[PDB]
Every structure is written in C-alpha cells, then in structure tokens.
Nucleic acid binder design. Structure first.
Ligand SMILES: [Mg+2]
Ligand SMILES: [Mg+2]
Ligand SMILES: [Mg+2]
Ligand SMILES: [Mg+2]
Ligand SMILES: [Mg+2]
Ligand SMILES: [Mg+2]
Ligand SMILES: [Mg+2]
Ligand SMILES: [Mg+2]
Ligand SMILES: [Mg+2]
Ligand SMILES: [Mg+2]
Ligand SMILES: [Mg+2]
Ligand SMILES: [Zn+2]
Ligand SMILES: [Zn+2]
Lengths: 177, 66, 82, 114, 77
RNA sequence: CCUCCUAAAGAGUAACGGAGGAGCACGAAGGUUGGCUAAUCCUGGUCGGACAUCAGGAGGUUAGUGCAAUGGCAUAAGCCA
RNA sequence: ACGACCAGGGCUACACACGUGCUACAAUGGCGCAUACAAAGAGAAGCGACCUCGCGAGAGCAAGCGGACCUCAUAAAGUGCGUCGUAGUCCGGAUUGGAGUCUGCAACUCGACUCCAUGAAGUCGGAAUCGCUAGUAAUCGUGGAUCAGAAUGCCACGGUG
RNA sequence: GCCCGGAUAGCUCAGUCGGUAGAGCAGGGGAUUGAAAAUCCCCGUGUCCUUGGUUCGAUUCCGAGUCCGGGCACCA
RNA sequence: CGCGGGGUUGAGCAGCCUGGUAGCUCGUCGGGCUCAUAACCCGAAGAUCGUCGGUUCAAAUCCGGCCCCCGCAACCA
RNA sequence: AAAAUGUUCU
C-alpha cells in the first residue's frame, strides 16, 4: 500500500521528468506480480507439491493455483494434466505489499547478494527473477522447512520498452547490477 | 478474494536492528525481528569494497619498498 | 615462501638483462634459465623465455604475474593422458 | 538467529554456532565473542537482540560468508588465467600444494573410476 | 574392384605409418614453439609466432588471417 | 463394415489397383447453461536441461477432435466450470 | 667419449593396480582450564635457558655447557573440574585460498612448520589377510642417527598396560 | 449359472470350534573348515486379499467376484 | 521374393509377449587365495537393444520399409 | 566331500 502511495506521487513524477511522456497513463505501471513454483519433481509425491504451495501462500498471502502440465513429455516423465507447478498471480494492494516485502525486506535476505540482473527484461518491459532458497522471505519458518525450495518472481508491467520497465523498477528502489 | 480458504493477512510490525520500524501486511502472524532492510544492507558500500581488491605490483612494493 | 625481511629474490643476471631491456624498450624475448626468480614490476611488458629443462617457454609478462616466480609459468613436465 | 546472511543453529553454543558462518572457524568465533563481551558457554537460546547485533557487527568487520567465497574463487580464477603451475593444477583437478599423484590424490582427483 | 582394393591397401599402409634449430624466434633459438594448423609454414615466405599463454609460441606463416586477427587484437604477443 | 483416392466436378462405378482404420469407447467423453481460444516461436526467469511451470510480445488454428482417414467445426463440433 | 665441468630440468610425473605406515571414523571420545609421574638420548660452523617482541611458526639480545652441572625439554596418556550428548557432529582432518616463519645462493617445478579461513572421504571396512603369549599386544608420548633445511620411515627410550 | 482343486514372510506351503503370527527355502549375522561344500545356531519381515456385518474386537465366520487346471453338459 | 521366426553387453540365451523396470549363464576387467597358473572367492564395469523411417507423451517393445540371418514352399501337366 | 597343471636346455 505504502509502495503504491509512493508511486502515485513520486515515482510517476520522476518518470515524467525523465522520459517526457504526454499523458500520465503513458507511464509504466506494474500490472501483476506472478509468483511461480514449478515443483516438477512432485511427480514422485504430491505431498511435496502441497508443501510448495503452502510455502508460496506463506510468502504471498494468496493461495496458489496448482498449474498442470499443458502437454506431455517423457524427458521429465510427466503426463498432460499432471499437477506440475503452482502459481500466484498477485494484483492490487496485496501485490504492492508483496513487492514492498521483496524489495525492502526479502531481497536483502538473499544469500551472497550483490544486486539483481538488469539484463533480464524480456523485451516488452516485464521483469522476472528467481529466488534460490525460499527461506529469504521471513514468512517461512526455518524449523518447519524440509526442502531447499525456490520460486520465480515475475513483475509484469504496462511498459512498451524494456528500458522504461527498468526505469520504473529503479524508481521502486531495485538494486540491479 | 475468495473467503475462508486463504491464509490470515494481518498488518504486522517488522523491526530490524538499525532502527527502521516497518509496518507491513504479511502472513507471519507474530511481529518480525529482521537483520537487514533496503536502508542498511550493503548494495552501495559492499559493491565499492568488493571491486577495490585486485593488485600485485602494489603488494610487491609493500613487501619490498625500493 | 621467501621471508619478507630477506627481500623478494631475483636472479642477478636476469635483473640486469631486464633492466637493459626496459632501458632500451627493444622487446625480443630474453633467454632465461633462472626459473627461481620472482617477477618484478619492471619485468611487466617484457617477454622472458623461461627454461623448462628442455626448451625456453616464452612467457609474456602480465601485471598479474609479479609476486610469482618465473618457473611458475613454464611447465617442466609434458603430460597429456594415459 | 541470522548473522552475515545465513541462519545460525539456535541450540548450539555461540563459539561453535558462529562457526556455521562461512569464513569463521573456532579462533575467529572466539575473537568475535570477545569483541561482543559474551562468554563461550552461552547458547543462541538465551541471547538478546542487542547482544546479537553487536556480534553481527563484529562479524561484518571480517571478510565473511559470500564475500569470502567470491574472493577465494576469484583468486583461483586468476591463478587459472595465469597458467602458472598452480593454475594448471587447479584446472586439472590435481594436487596444487606439491603432493604425490602416483598415489593418494583422491580428494582433488575425485573417487577413482577404473 | 581391384582399384578399390588397392586404395584400401594404401589407406591401411598410411594408418600403419601414422601408428630444435627448426624455428629460431627472433635471434634466440630453442624456444618452445609449434606450427599452427590454420596454415602450416615450412620454407614459407616468412613466419610469425604468437606467444601463447600455454604451449609457448604458435608459428602462423606471415600474411595469415588468424595471425592478422591476433595482431589487431593485441600486437605485443 | 468405415475413410480417401482410383471415379472421367451430381449419384454410382471394377480390378489379387493404390493407401489406412473398425469389430469400440464414454453415466461423462451425454444434456444443457456460463465462460475461455489454440500449435509453435522469441526474449526473460529457482533447481530446470533441446523438453516440465511462470511472465509478456510474435503467431493466427499451423492445433484440438477418446481412435483411421475424409469432410467438417470459432456461433466453435476444441478446452474449462 | 659410455670420460669430465656447468646451468636448468627429472628422480616428487598420474586413467590406474599392489605393499608398508600414519590419521581417522569418535563419548574408553573431543574440546577447555588446572595438576602429577618418566626413561633414554643428542649438543661447539652445536644445543641454545632467562628477559623482550611476536596470536603462532619464530625474531632480537644473550648467559650457560665439549655437558650427572647448561641446553634441547613443559613428557603424553593419566588425574580433577567444566562443557559437547551420538549428529557427518565442537568427531575427522584431507583439500584448497589467503597471510606468514625458518633453513638455505635458491623453497616455481619441489621443503617443513605456523596463523586464519576452507572442513573431502570416512559412521569400523568384500573376498581375503597380518602381528602379538607379558611389562608382550594395544596404546601414549620422548630422543637419536643422516641432516643447512626436510620424517607418519628407521633405530632407540620410557609411561600406561 | 454342473462339480471339484489353488490366493500370506522375498519366494514355495502347513494351520486353532471368538483374542497369536509358525515351518523348509531365499536374505542378514555368527559358529565351523587351511580354503570352499554340506552343516548348525540365531534372529529376522507379513491389513493372513479387499470391503461391509454378527459382536467385545475377530486370518478364523458370514454377504460380496476375478484367474488357471480336469471332467461332464448346454449354446439360436 | 511367396510364408513364418530372429537379429539385444565379447558369446549364448531371456525380455518384446502387448510400450514405459536391460536380466541369466559364460566371457572381460580389478582384487584375493597359490610359489605360480588353474579352479574357487569377492567387487566391478558393459547395451542408440541390425539399421532406417514412423507412431507416439515415450519404442527394445507397436507398425512400416531396408540390411543380414534361419526355417520354408516353390508344385499339376 | 572337492585340491588340475608347472615352457625348453643347464
Ligand atoms: Mg565455518
Ligand atoms: Mg462422383
Ligand atoms: Mg462424372
Ligand atoms: Mg525458455
Ligand atoms: Mg645440475
Ligand atoms: Mg624415488
Ligand atoms: Mg639431532
Ligand atoms: Mg576437531
Ligand atoms: Mg559421506
Ligand atoms: Mg613366543
Ligand atoms: Mg633434521
Ligand atoms: Zn535494516
Ligand atoms: Zn596460420
């Protein structure tokens, strides 16, 4: 919420100053943050998958959508319609909160952290990262975890260009490299 | 959001070591005691320090001094 | 390795040769047998052909090679595989 | 119970607990403790936040955890680049420090195949 | 068929067969060197040696493409 | 018994002509109501790789149809509830 | 020249197989502090107290002693308290990175030891197989020789037993 | 739907008229042999096939069907 | 070129038998026993499952074709 | 119960 508030008054203004946009609608805005834990190895056991889902939920206060396999592949020994991942599409106040947590609290907790990768923006403005150890979110209790698990965070935004997206991210602190 | 079957989402009080009292909505439940935040964690000084290391000639000079 | 009080070792002849080379700035790789010799800051830029028992392997002296001995960059045994 | 990145064992005695951090062993842990003003016998359970903070600060003063890894790794890389005997050894996965390879290099060699 | 057989025999023979003044780099002989396979100089119209990091010098034959590239990159080796 | 072609633009049309399938399956895979739109490709991103899952763009039905082929199918006959 | 002198390299190589050792895998243990008890030796281009510096290997000054005198040289297991509580651990120390010390013209190939860091394998070992009948085995240390330096080897010595 | 044979320890098979897990073999260890067989000890591992029900629970005892073997009889 | 069967670790056989689990004996390799080789004991490695297409989520497995093999029938005048 | 053999000339 705080982050959102900051954005409306400050970040947007900064963007306007720097890029010289015509409208206030033209400024990039983050549309959704899409968390994903593609557990995969849950083909052996669904309990693991469940655990992963729980962890995800803890991290970001929604409850994940257990994404199944779209097409079958024998390289990983999966069928189509196998629970083979879990996602959390975040939007709005909750999403903002999550973002804040990531940037202000959780990214600082990353092990051996010397900033993010700036060269990781998909072309069309949207950012993605992935946490190696999911303990970095303080929502997880270290005594309870059984698996060295992780997820990928994915900041979707209205930015047309990658550069714009990057700028937006910067305006929301974001260390990069 | 669909009621009941989400986890609880209370506005807890995160409090790190360096005086940054931080109120956020999370699903920990209890109040959080952090190490590091954006207003302390080295992504400004650390970077600087890491970079400033490499050198052989200087070392040699130090060892010898003429 | 060598004591800090005793001062980093260099073969006298190589030191002289190196000095000469630096003075001239003439390039042309120096034939060297004394592998036991710490590379100096003045040696940077030069090529020194360090003996390996059989041949004089030419080492182009980089800034990173200083506190090393010459023979470090001049492998004596020629092993590939069994 | 976080210090310099990674988590520390809650039950273990501080001297030993600290040792969990990459870049502190026994002696360094002891030193840290001394700096703090804490005894060796006390556990992370029954250890105050303020107390912890000081310890953390002390630890920071040393090149530890990820930083240490980065440094050591970097050194190795440099050596490799140099192609100095040591560098060569590193690249091959043979003993750097001047051991016999005819027999008993199994740590650096890895577990024998034939 | 006979021709083919002969060819085979020749090949076999070749296989069976298969089974330091040379290059004085810049007025100092006995330097660790080797001929490069990009173009292999014998009595060629001059040669040039790239001082490699490992395996000493690689002789290239003067007016080579690889050698030119190397020069462009860094002339001091 | 079914699909194509042979078959000469209605139907039909032979050959020990050329190609493949069927002898079922499904109480949902049927009925309906509401919704959704594919294969593939690029860039990016925890283990994750040429190939699982997630971002967006290109793509525009190349896919899908419980199974052969043909004809169909976005109003979808495809995929969800 | 299959003789001789020199410099550098090699005898230390490493898919691998065997021998003999050491260290381990731990609680009859480790780690920490306190404290007791040896024997045998060696030593003048040597051994090198005390005092000072150095976390330490060691450095500085420097007596003493060709040594029942002085030195190497505080024996270690043990014992007494504390801690760890069966974990790949406060076991284990390999490995490797960094910083060093000494010797010696010289420690790159290729020395040892130190410090800090790193903390492999290994949780008692398949077939098989060796030693030992008493102060023996097992275990714990200590010295010597050669040796500038450099032993887990060898040769001795005692302790526990 | 005519009859009758067989469903457990890893495998091959015995067995109580209501309260429990037993053999030979295979696997682990040991004893033995100079070595290996054959011994010989010892442990070990099982929702007695799954599910309702009588009842205090019940391989045990009733209601509920596939698979292979032999014979006899039907079948437009 | 008409009918079947097969091609798999160096050899021989299983598996295919109705796709997703590479096994058995001999050999090989490394140990051990021995004086030494045998025999025996222990440990280990080894295979794009003829080849090429294809079907597929995926093939050793199902299907086609081709390569080599082994049966076989190739007749009545 | 089971235990085969030992390259030639000295
Ligand atoms: Mg540590
Ligand atoms: Mg018609
Ligand atoms: Mg017509
Ligand atoms: Mg991708
Ligand atoms: Mg010599
Ligand atoms: Mg030798
Ligand atoms: Mg002595
Ligand atoms: Mg220890
Ligand atoms: Mg292990
Ligand atoms: Mg006797
Ligand atoms: Mg000595
Ligand atoms: Zn903070
Ligand atoms: Zn060339």
């Amino acid at each position: 919420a705080k982050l959102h508030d900051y954005y409306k008054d400050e970040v947007v203004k900064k963007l306007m100053t720097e890029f010289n946009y015509n409208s206030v609608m033209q400024v990039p805005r983050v549309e959704k943050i899409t968390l994903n834990m593609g557990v995969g190895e849950a083909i052996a056991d669904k309990k693991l998958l469940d655990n992963a889902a729980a962890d995800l939920a803890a991290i970001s206060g929604q409850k994940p959508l257990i994404t199944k396999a779209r097409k079958s592949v024998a390289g990983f020994k999966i069928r189509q319609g196998y629970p083979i991942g879990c996602k959390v599409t975040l939007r709005g106040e909750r999403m903002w909160e999550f973002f804040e947590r990531l940037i202000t609290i959780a990214v600082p907790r990353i092990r051996d952290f010397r900033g993010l990768s700036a060269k990781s923006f998909d072309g069309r403005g949207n950012y993605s990262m992935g946490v190696r150890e999911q303990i970095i979110f303080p929502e997880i209790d270290y005594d309870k975890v059984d698996r060295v698990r992780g997820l990928d965070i994915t900041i979707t935004t209205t930015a047309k260009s990658d550069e714009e997206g990057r700028a937006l991210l910067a305006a929301f602190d974001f260390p990069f490299r | 959001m669909k009621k009941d079957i989400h986890p609880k989402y209370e506005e807890i009080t995160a409090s790190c070591s360096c005086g940054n009292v931080m109120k956020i909505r999370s699903t920990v439940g209890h109040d959080l005691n952090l190490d590091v935040c954006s207003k302390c964690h080295p992504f400004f000084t650390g970077k600087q320090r890491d970079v400033a290391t490499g050198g052989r000639v200087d070392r040699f000079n130090k060892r010898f001094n003429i | 390795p060598r004591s800090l009080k005793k001062g980093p070792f260099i073969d006298l002849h190589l030191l002289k040769k190196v000095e000469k080379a630096v003075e001239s700035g003439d390039k042309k790789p120096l034939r060297t047998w004394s592998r036991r010799s710490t590379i100096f800051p003045n040696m940077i830029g030069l090529t020194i052909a360090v003996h390996n028992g059989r041949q004089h392997v030419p080492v182009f002296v980089t800034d990173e090679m200083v506190g090393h001995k010459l023979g470090e960059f001049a492998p004596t045994r020629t092993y590939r595989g069994h | 119970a976080r210090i310099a990145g990674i988590n520390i064992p809650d039950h273990k005695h501080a001297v030993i607990a600290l040792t969990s951090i990459y870049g502190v062993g026994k002696t360094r842990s002891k030193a840290i403790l001394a700096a703090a003003g804490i005894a060796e016998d006390v556990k992370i359970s029954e250890l105050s936040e303020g107390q912890i903070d000081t310890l953390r600060d002390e630890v920071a003063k040393f090149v530890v955890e990820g930083d240490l890894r980065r440094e050591i790794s970097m050194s190795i890389k440099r050596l490799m680049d140099l192609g100095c005997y040591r560098g060569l050894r590193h690249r091959r996965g043979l003993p750097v420090r001047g051991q016999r390879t005819k027999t008993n290099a199994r740590t650096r060699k890895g577990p024998r195949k034939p | 068929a006979e021709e083919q057989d002969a060819a085979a025999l020749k090949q076999l023979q070749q296989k069976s067969y298969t089974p330091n003044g040379r290059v004085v780099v810049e007025g100092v002989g006995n330097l660790m060197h080797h001929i490069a396979r990009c173009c292999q100089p014998i009595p060629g119209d001059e040669i040039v040696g790239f001082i490699t990091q490992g395996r000493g010098i690689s002789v290239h034959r003067a007016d080579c493409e690889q050698l030119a590239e190397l020069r462009s990159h860094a002339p001091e080796r």
